[PDB]
Each structure stands twice: as C-alpha cells, then as structure tokens.
Scaffold this active site. Structure first.
Site, PDB file in Angstrom:
ATOM      1  N   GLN A  74       6.940   7.764 -10.207  1.00 56.13           N
ATOM      2  CA  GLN A  74       6.188   8.820  -9.473  1.00 56.13           C
ATOM      3  C   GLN A  74       7.010   9.347  -8.292  1.00 56.13           C
ATOM      4  OE1 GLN A  74       2.003   6.933  -9.222  1.00 56.13           O
ATOM      5  NE2 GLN A  74       1.629   9.133  -9.103  1.00 56.13           N
ATOM      6  N   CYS A 121      -1.602   0.275 -13.531  1.00 50.89           N
ATOM      7  CA  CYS A 121      -1.748   0.300 -12.052  1.00 50.89           C
ATOM      8  C   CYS A 121      -2.987   1.172 -11.855  1.00 50.89           C
ATOM      9  CB  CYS A 121      -0.410   0.712 -11.438  1.00 50.89           C
ATOM     10  SG  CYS A 121       0.313   2.192 -12.191  1.00 50.89           S
ATOM     11  N   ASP A 169       0.864  -1.216   0.000  1.00 46.87           N
ATOM     12  CA  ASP A 169       0.000   0.000   0.000  1.00 46.87           C
ATOM     13  C   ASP A 169       0.884   1.245   0.000  1.00 46.87           C
ATOM     14  OD1 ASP A 169      -2.339  -1.522   0.041  1.00 46.87           O
ATOM     15  OD2 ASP A 169      -3.284  -0.224   1.513  1.00 46.87           O
ATOM     16  N   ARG A 204       3.991   2.375 -10.773  1.00 47.71           N
ATOM     17  CA  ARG A 204       4.364   0.942 -10.827  1.00 47.71           C
ATOM     18  C   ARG A 204       4.489   0.488 -12.284  1.00 47.71           C
ATOM     19  NH1 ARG A 204      -0.111  -1.117  -6.341  1.00 47.71           N
ATOM     20  NH2 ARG A 204       0.392   0.529  -4.818  1.00 47.71           N
ATOM     21  N   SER A 205       3.558   0.908 -13.130  1.00 52.80           N
ATOM     22  CA  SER A 205       3.523   0.569 -14.581  1.00 52.80           C
ATOM     23  C   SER A 205       4.839   1.001 -15.220  1.00 52.80           C
ATOM     24  CB  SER A 205       2.361   1.240 -15.269  1.00 52.80           C
ATOM     25  OG  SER A 205       1.114   0.740 -14.826  1.00 52.80           O
TER      26      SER A 205
END
Ligand SMILES: N#Cc1ccc(CNC(=O)N2CCOCC2)cc1
Length: 281
Positions: free
Chosen positions: A261, A214, A180, A220-221
């Site tokens: 990110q 994602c 998370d 994450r992608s």
C-alpha cells in the site's frame, strides 16, 4: 542483486518513485461481481475489490460472493487466499471459505482495534468454554488452546461442519505487534513469525491455501506473501540473485489489486527478503 539495488534506492531516497512505477505498471481487471449492489455490505472498503477472474466463490447458491482472492505463484508451488478482515455480517462466510478451500492456517496481521477504530470483527472464540456457532453457514468454532508470545499468538481451533459432523483443526497465527503507523523498525520478529507459519505445515501443498488477512487484505497481507514467495524462489533457482522483488510483486498484482500500500511497506519487503536470505544461505 537486491542488497545493492536497496542501497541505491535508499541512498537516493527513490522509494516513492519505484513505488509509483509499480502502481503504473500494475494490472487492471474487471471486478463486476464485487460492485453489484447486493454485495455492497460484503465489502469493508469500496475501493478494494477482488478481480472476477481470481475471486474465491462460496459454494452457497444464493450469493457466492466474498472479498477474497486466490494468489497462485506457479513456479514457487505456493497459493494464498488474501481476504479482508471479516465484517460482523461476513464472519460466517469467512469460516465457510476456510472450510470449502481446506485451508489449515489463518494468518492475521492486524489487531481488532487500531487507531481507536475496529479493523476486523472478533471472528474467533476468546475462551475454551464459549464456542461460536455461525447459524447462516452451519459451522461451530471452538478454541482448543492459545499460546501467547511477545510478538504473536498461535491458537488451535476446531472447526465443525454441523451439517456433516466432520471436524478439522485450524491454526490461527496472529501477529500482534505491527505498529498503528508505519512498519516495524527491524524485520526480525516478522521473519520469526513467517518461519513459524512455514514450520506448521500451513503453507504446504498437502493443504488448501493459507488464508491471509489484515484490514483490507492488500498491505501487510501483501508483505507476508511477497516475502514468503521471494525467499522460496531463492531456494529453488540456480541463481538466487535472478529474483526481482518488483517482478514478483507485479505478478501477484495480477491476482489482487493494490498489494503493498505504501513505499514504506515496499522498503520493508526488501529488508525482510534481504535479511531472510541470510538465514537461507
Ligand atoms: N512463482 C512465481 C513467479 C515467477 C516469476 C515471476 C516474474 N518473472 C520472473 O521472475 N522471471 C525471471 C527471469 O526469467 C523469467 C521471468 C513472478 C512470480
């Protein structure tokens, strides 16, 4: 070499600074189609838009818009579609894109619920006997089989074009253990997952580009595509150490904004590539 560059940045704690230089060097292209008022409810986040030049167009005359970008890595022979987690109203558009682009694999790097909020619509069937029909795009989706492992799930899906009665098999690769908050401690299970996608044939030039998502399709992608492309380039080049992660990331950012990110995702990308290189040398 990046192992030494890693120790430098790590020992000096310069990750936020490297990350900021990437942010400042990154391309900025128009995203006019994404900002049209008729497209407001096709975007999960108002600050995450595909560039007009690299956006995927749906083949429907009414509204061709989906929040999805084609990343083309010419030297590496690799192309990826990066997209957001579908919305309740775009699940049909998502599967239409998969159909139209002849994709063989869907890579999902999020859970449907994280931090107590929905990150994605449930866009695939949960049981063999309960298929999904997308009336807006005339597609039927059936769960054929589901292989649940510790770190990921692989699902075989049948996608049927109800208009032409053609069927295709789609593989759904679902990485279920990204935490998370922050990034995995070790890249081992992420690398295992990436090698499983590769072994399936889903990233091969015989097929349309893999669809990777994602929630926003940037964080994450981004780590997924960056690690795959970097490892591929290290196999292809006379000098594997001529691969600069930062130059690869900036190239991919010409195709979709904001890939990677956080400074932690950047550090994790270095660690994944460094560790993956051991299994490749
Ligand atoms: N697929 C791919 C791909 C290839 C290159 C880049 C960035 N440029 C680069 O690495 N070099 C290496 C040193 O001489 C030429 C420029 C990004 C993506």
């Amino acid at each position: 070499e990046m192992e030494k560059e890693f120790e430098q940045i790590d020992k000096s704690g310069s990750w936020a600074a490297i990350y900021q230089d990437i942010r400042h060097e990154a391309s900025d292209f128009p995203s006019r189609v994404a900002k049209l008022p008729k497209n407001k409810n096709r975007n999960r986040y108002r600050d995450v838009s595909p560039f007009d030049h690299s956006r995927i167009k749906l083949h429907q005359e009414d509204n061709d818009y989906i929040n999805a970008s084609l990343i083309k890595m010419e030297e590496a022979q690799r192309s990826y579609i990066l997209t957001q987690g579908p919305l309740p109203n775009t699940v049909g558009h998502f599967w239409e894109m998969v159909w139209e682009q002849k994709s063989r694999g869907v890579v999902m790097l999020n859970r449907v619920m994280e931090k107590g909020s929905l990150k994605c619509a449930q866009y695939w069937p949960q049981k063999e006997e309960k298929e999904m029909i997308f009336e807006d795009t005339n597609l039927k989706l059936t769960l054929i089989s589901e292989d649940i492992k510790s770190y990921y799930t692989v699902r075989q899906l049948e996608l049927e074009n109800l208009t032409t009665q053609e069927t295709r098999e789609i593989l759904h690769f679902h990485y279920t253990t990204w935490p998370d908050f922050g990034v995995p401690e070790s890249p081992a299970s992420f690398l295992n997952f990436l090698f499983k996608v590769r072994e399936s044939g889903s990233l091969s030039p015989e097929h349309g580009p893999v669809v990777v998502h994602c929630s926003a399709g940037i964080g994450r992608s981004g780590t997924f595509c960056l690690a795959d492309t970097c490892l591929l380039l290290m196999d292809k080049r006379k000098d594997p150490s001529s691969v600069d992660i930062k130059k690869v990331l900036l190239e991919m950012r010409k195709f979709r904004m904001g890939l990677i990110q956080t400074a932690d995702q950047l550090r994790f990308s270095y660690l994944a590539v460094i560790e993956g290189a051991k299994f490749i040398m």
